[PDB]
């Protein structure tokens, strides 16, 4: 049996005060998101539901499309 999943990301803590330059928005009801689809094209929609347990969220799209998107395929539409 294997114990390690191979590939470690961020395993060190800060020793001195460090400011935040790249902020990351959160998943909430009424959040304009960009749901990336498997066709290579992006999708615009607002958050109708949130699943912070399985890292998922439901969003209502411009063309009345209610599609379930993952927090990894989502890009907050702000800038």
């Amino acid at each position: 049996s294997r114990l390690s999943r191979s590939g470690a990301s961020s395993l060190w803590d800060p020793a001195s005060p460090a400011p935040t330059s790249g902020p990351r928005p959160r998943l909430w009801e009424g959040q304009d998101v960009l749901a990336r689809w498997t066709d290579g094209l992006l999708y615009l929609g607002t958050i109708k539901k949130v699943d912070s347990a399985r890292e998922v969220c439901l969003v209502q799209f411009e063309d009345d499309s209610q599609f379930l998107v993952l927090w990894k395929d989502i890009s907050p539409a702000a800038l």
Binding site: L41, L42, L44, G45, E62, S75
Partner: peptide
């Protein structure tokens, strides 16, 4: 070209 439904980053 489309322009009536979703309006994401560019497409």
């Amino acid at each position: 070209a489309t322009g009536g439904v979703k309006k994401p980053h560019r497409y």
